[PDB]
Structures are given as structure tokens and as C-alpha cells.
Design a protein around this ligand. Structure first.
Ligand SMILES: NCCCC(O)(P(=O)(O)O)P(=O)(O)O
Ligand SMILES: [Mg+2]
Ligand SMILES: [Mg+2]
Ligand SMILES: [Mg+2]
Lengths: 307, 308
């Protein structure tokens, strides 16, 4: 067995009240769309994560789209990346899903993932709010390429160097795309003058690092049973020669240090000329949400139980 | 009050351009001809820096004297600006924040093909000269990407000077993140593509693997530069050094800090090799311009190690 370390995050946030309802809605959508007994899915709690990602006074339509998006993400990652399909099949799937992102109809309406992604795209564009869709599509392309990289690593059966995994994981979790979608769906648009600043980019990188290392720390057991070798705990144990417990301890230590660096940069931001006032403030707060979201939600989700 | 700097074996060797020594002399000439230095000054530390040998590391062996000369000019202008604005702060030669902001504005104006607002400033004269010569020596390149990297470079300069005025080194993660902008490494990749004759397709450069490999190589280059320049930067007060930050926040002696920095260099080089070797399976062949780009990435790693 393994002992999951604790993660002190000085960032708290209230959850949306209809979370349980969204859980039910999640199953409905999947069964209504064709991606999929309904009480092992309610235990995962895809609607409560969505509740962590939306504002407290948000419409059922918005919270519903958040639940739909997180449910589609969970199905693609598990179905296509780490529960193996051939590489050619995966490449054609990437092409087809990229075509849906090109506003064309689904090339294979019989594929459940393709229909689901078309639904997600239509629903997202309905609550447009005037967002940079092209940047989101670019992050999605990098996400697909990183998925292919992960599948290569799984086929070899050995974890990459910690540096190589840490680099590619930011694309493999599509965290930057989640930042873009959060800006789109909630109703704030940060200036392009601010986002292209080096300090903001490195702050985003720190926050994404914290989120992804926390996710690895919590999901290590399920990812090890399935053979998903793209885990920071895996690589630390393999290349630094440490026990799984020592590896998890080292990863939690790295999480702590990255959080400290994140706070240091956030405090330095005003002096450089970037005030955390308007859309910049809500963007930084969204960055803070995903870090707390992993710590609080992963311990409450039935994704990681091995019962 | 001493330190022992560890060695660094990097298995990337290359034949050097023969006229390197000439460029060293030419370097001093340019610095005298533009106004950055003058006449009576001992031209023994400028020949000791070896700006022409770095230029030789950055060009092909069968290249024109014009090419080596421009590389030396660019590396000499970068070295003077770094010392003038970043490393000579906290002293009587220190620049003010208003002066640095005006320099940013004017140099950005020179970078937008406009004439220098203050032709009396030597930095502006040198940058205008570099810009005119470079625009003559090339074409079909991403100029906008280079200008954006320059904007991020200036922003990182502002961050570093704030950190210096506080008198405290930043967190290791925050330092590692912002250093890539503070070292103008991505701009150097773009310029290397520019001065040579290779242009890799955008389908390849925008690939996720190519982006993260660049990050590993830039990390290695910058950490090596810090490991070697730690003693001088610690004496002068430049707090943006990885050894300094390891000593400050990780609770280690200066020797342990340098040892950890060298260990991180080793581990990052191994990671770089792992990704570089795996690259073909993902669909990126190291054949045409992509191979020459990777060779430039490897060159900057070895050049910094040797140039101590
Ligand atoms: N957006 C999809 C996120 C999926 C994961 O977070 P999970 O731990 O839930 O499997 P990953 O496979 O990245 O570890
Ligand atoms: Mg995955
Ligand atoms: Mg997964
Ligand atoms: Mg995981």
C-alpha cells in the first residue's frame, strides 16, 4: 500500500450548491450521448469539480457546461491514452476531433467521443462571451501531441526523466486551455498586454506545475495499476532511486516549494506595473482555484480507491 | 572567502571557425568605433573575454567574415548592455529606473525600424548598427517573434532590477522561470536561424516536443552561465543567480549550492538527450533545418560551459 501526504493550501473557496444535481446530470449526458448502473459514476463527482470551477451565483446552463466538459475530458483521457487502440487509430481520431474544432460537422457521427465533442463545442460557443477560440484550439493541438508523447512513453514502459515529464505534463493536462475556458465561460477578458508579460506567463507555469503535481500525487495508485507511466512519482522513484513513499514525500515537498514561489511572484507582480485589479484579479484568482481544487476535490472523488 | 567551481563535461564538440582570434581584435575595434569604449583602455580584458570565439561557436565553419563579424558585434552589444543596465546597478555607475525605462522605449523604437531618438547614447548607436547590418544579412525570418522575445527580455530586466533593489535572491522556481526571458535565449535561437541559412517549418516549431526541448536546452545554458559567474555576481550584488538562491532558500552552504546546481545541470542534460533521441518516433525527423536548429541548441550548451 501507500500513504498519501497532506497538502496545506492557504487558498479557500466556496463550492456551488447544485453540485450533487450536476453529478446526476453528468450521467444523463453520457448516457444520452452514447459514451456509456449509475451509482459508481455519481461517486466520482464530476459535477462537484465543475462546482469548484464556476462562480457561486452561476446559471444551471454554465455549471452544466462545466460538468459536460469535465466529463468529456475524463472519457477521452481514459478511453484513448492510458487504457490501451493503435497509433494510427489515435492519429485519425486526433484529425477528426480537430476537424470538429474547425466548426465542421463530425466526420464519424457513430463515434461517441466525436458526438460528445461536437456537443461540447456547440454548447461552449453558445455561451461565447467573445473569447479567443483560436488560442484554445492551439492549446488543444498541443494537448493532442502531448497525448501521443504519453502513449509512446507507456508503450516503452519506463518513465521519462523528471524534467522531460514536468515539461510535457503542462500540455498533457491541458491546464492553459482550462484557463482560457474559465475566462470565456465566467465573463472576464484579460488584456493581451497583460497575458504576454513574462511574469504572468511564469506565474501560470508555477500554478500549472502545482496543479499537475498534486493530481499525480493523488492519482498515483490508479495510474500505477493501469500502467500510465507518465507520473511524476513514477519518474522520481525510477530515476532518483527512492521508495514510492519517499517519491510521494519528495513530490509533496516540491508542491510546497512551488506554492511558495507562486506566492512570491504574485506579490512581486504589482511592482512591475501589473495591478491585480480588474480582469487580471479574476484571472489570478482562477489560477488559485485550480490549485485548491486538486487538493480538496481529489480526496473527495471516488476515482482513486482500488477497492 | 573562496569557492571551488566544479567542472562540466558536455559531450558536444565541434570544429571552430579559424578566424576567431581576428574577431576578438575586431570586437575591440567595434567597441571603440561605436563609443562603448575608447583608446587608452587596456584592451586585454576584451581579448580575454573572447567575444570572437563565442561567435565562432555560433557560426558554421565555412562562413563569411561578415557572418562571424556580425555575431561578434551582437554578442558584444549584448554584453555591454547587460553590464550597463543590469549588473552595474547598486553602484555609482548604476542607472535609474527612469533611465532604464527611457532606454526600453528608445531601443524599442530603434527595433521598429525608426531612427534612434538620442544618437548620443552609445547603446542606441550600437543597437542601430546591429539592426541595420542584420537586416542586410537576411530575409524571410520571423521578425515579430524576435521583437516579442525582446519585449519579454526587457520585462525580465525590470524584474531582475526589482529583485536587486530589494537585495535578496528569489525562489529557485521563480528564478528558473524568469531566467529564460532574462537571458534572451529564445531570441538567440531566432537569431541563429537568421544569421545562418536555415528556416524550420512552423508545423515543427509549434510542436509541443520542440517547445519543451528548447526549454531544457535554455535551462542548461543559463544554469551553466550562473554556475560560472556566481563569484563575480556575488561580489557585485547581482542576486539573480541559482547558486545564490539555493544558498538562501534551500539552506545550503555556497559549496553545496554549486554542487546542487551542477547536479541539476547533469540531470537536465540527460533529460534533453532523452527527448532529443525520442523525437523521431513522434514524427519529427532530425533531417533538414530541424537538425541544424537542434545543432544550434546543442552549440549554446557547450559554448557556455567552455567559455568560462
Ligand atoms: N483533463 C483530464 C484529466 C485526467 C487526469 O487528471 P486523471 O488523474 O483524472 O486520470 P490525468 O490523466 O491527466 O492524470
Ligand atoms: Mg491523461
Ligand atoms: Mg487519466
Ligand atoms: Mg492523474
Amino acid at each position: 500500500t501507500i500513504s498519501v501526504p497532506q497538502l496545506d493550501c492557504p487558498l479557500s473557496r466556496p463550492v456551488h450548491p447544485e453540485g450533487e444535481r450536476a453529478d446526476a446530470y453528468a450521467v444523463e449526458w453520457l448516457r444520452g450521448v452514447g459514451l456509456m448502473d449509475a451509482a459508481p459514476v455519481l461517486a466520482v463527482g464530476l459535477g462537484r469539480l465543475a462546482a469548484c470551477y464556476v462562480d457561486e451565483n452561476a446559471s444551471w446552463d454554465t455549471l452544466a457546461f462545466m460538468t459536460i466538459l469535465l466529463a468529456w475530458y475524463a472519457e477521452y483521457d481514459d478511453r484513448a491514452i492510458d487504457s490501451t487502440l493503435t497509433d494510427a487509430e489515435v492519429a485519425e481520431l486526433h484529425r477528426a476531433l480537430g476537424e470538429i474544432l474547425r466548426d465542421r460537422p463530425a466526420p464519424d457521427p457513430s463515434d461517441p467521443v466525436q458526438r460528445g465533442l461536437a456537443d461540447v463545442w456547440r454548447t461552449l460557443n453558445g455561451l461565447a462571451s467573445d473569447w479567443d477560440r483560436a488560442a484554445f484550439v492551439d492549446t488543444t493541438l498541443r494537448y493532442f501531441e502531448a497525448n501521443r508523447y504519453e502513449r509512446v512513453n507507456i508503450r516503452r514502459g519506463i518513465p521519462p526523466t523528471p524534467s522531460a515529464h514536468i515539461g510535457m505534463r503542462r500540455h498533457g493536462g491541458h491546464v492553459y486551455g482550462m484557463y482560457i475556458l474559465g475566462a470565456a465561460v465566467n465573463g472576464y477578458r484579460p488584456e493581451r498586454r497583460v497575458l504576454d508579460h513574462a511574469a504572468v506567463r511564469e506565474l501560470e507555469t508555477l500554478a500549472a506545475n502545482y496543479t499537475s503535481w498534486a493530481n499525480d500525487l493523488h492519482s498515483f495508485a490508479r495510474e500505477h495499476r493501469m500502467g500510465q507511466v507518465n507520473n511524476l512519482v513514477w519518474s522520481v522513484h525510477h530515476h532518483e532511486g527512492l521508495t514510492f513513499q519517499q517519491a510521494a514525500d519528495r513530490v509533496a515537498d516540491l508542491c510546497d516549494k512551488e506554492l511558495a514561489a507562486y506566492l512570491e511572484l504574485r506579490q512581486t507582480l504589482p511592482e512591475l506595473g501589473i495591478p491585480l485589479t480588474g480582469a487580471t484579479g479574476r484571472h489570478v484568482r482562477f489560477l488559485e482555484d485550480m490549485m485548491w481544487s486538486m487538493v480538496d476535490w481529489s480526496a473527495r472523488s471516488a476515482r482513486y480507491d482500488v477497492v
